[PDB]
Write a protein that binds this ligand. Structure first.
Ligand code: CNC
Ligand SMILES: [Ca+2]
Length: 224
């Protein structure tokens, strides 16, 4: 029932960013270059995940998946690993979103899924975590005022069933003791969304240089 990502295959290595997904390719002009854009969708049960891969750049956006256990930071060369180096609830596979440009991306259900009594797991990627914690060429190391959050909104036939915020990293508080960055799979309660045919995800950050990723897993399970 739950989206576990299990029994999605790995054609190459320990993750899928879209380079080996089958999809539809068109030529588009982007940042001044004509490039080949592949739009693909992978499925897990009733749920559909859109992926966009630009062939010439090797860049991607939208959704991918992983079983990666490598937790050594190596900027974008290790971008598909969740901080725990394993999926949630001891499972091998998990999802990755590169929710590029701080806009909205969706999981599309063929049939309504009821989140009553249920939730999902999220955490940070190694790349994003390390960037926020320590800083890089694009990011000032997180201090008072910094944050990374995700808004999760349910829809049913394009009508909102409710909207929830959850902080992947919260340094906003004047009280330093309130500051944290998630390094573990963390349960997010989605009960109030009820029956949805679409879940929308949007990241927001104090700093636009923060790698716009989250790790997600076990979508639609009971609290443990
Ligand atoms: C344009 C752009 C941007 N990108 Co790229 C994205 N999406 N990117 C791209 C494209 C570059 C096109 C080109 N070279 O012609 C494009 C789509 C290929 C790309 C690719 C990537 N990008 C990536 C990321 C994560 C980032 N990108 C941003 C720089 C991110 C930007 C948003 C932002 N917040 O800054 C961004 C939208 C605007 C940059 C810009 O135009 N600056 C103005 C320009 C005049 O200045 P510049 O300093 O010369 O910009 C150069 C660099 O930004 C470089 N570059 C672009 N992305 C990266 C990523 C890294 C790690 C490095 C070292 C350099 C770059 O290319 C620019 C032109 O040469 C980023 C800050 C967005 C974000 N917040 O997530 C972030 C880096 C985060 C970090 N702290 O390390 C990818 C890993 C995304 C992916 N999932 O595939 C990937 C890495 C390279 C690869 N090919 O695999
Ligand atoms: Ca899993």
């Amino acid at each position: 029932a739950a989206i576990s990502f299990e029994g999605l295959g790995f054609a190459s290595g320990d993750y899928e960013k879209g380079a080996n997904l089958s999809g539809v390719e068109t030529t588009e002009n982007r940042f001044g270059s004509d490039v080949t854009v592949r739009r693909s969708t992978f499925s897990h049960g009733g749920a559909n995940f859109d992926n966009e891969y630009v062939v010439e750049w090797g860049s991607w956006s939208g959704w991918g998946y992983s079983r990666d256990t490598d937790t050594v930071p190596n900027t974008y060369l290790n971008q598909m690993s969740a901080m725990p180096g394993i999926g949630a609830q001891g499972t091998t596979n998990y999802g990755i979103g590169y929710l590029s440009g701080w806009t909205t991306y969706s999981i599309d259900y063929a049939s309504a899924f009821d989140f009553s009594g249920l939730g999902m797991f999220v955490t940070n990627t190694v790349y994003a975590y390390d960037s926020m914690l320590n800083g890089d060429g694009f990011v000032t190391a997180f201090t008072t005022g910094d944050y990374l959050k995700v808004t999760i909104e349910g829809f049913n036939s394009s009508i909102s069933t409710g909207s929830l915020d959850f902080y992947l990293a919260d340094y906003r508080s004047a009280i330093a003791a309130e500051h944290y960055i998630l390094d573990a799979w963390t349960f997010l309660d989605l009960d109030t969304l009820g029956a949805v045919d679409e879940l929308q995800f949007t990241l927001e950050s104090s700093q636009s240089g923060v790698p716009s990723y989250l790790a997600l897993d076990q979508v639609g399970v009971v609290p443990e």
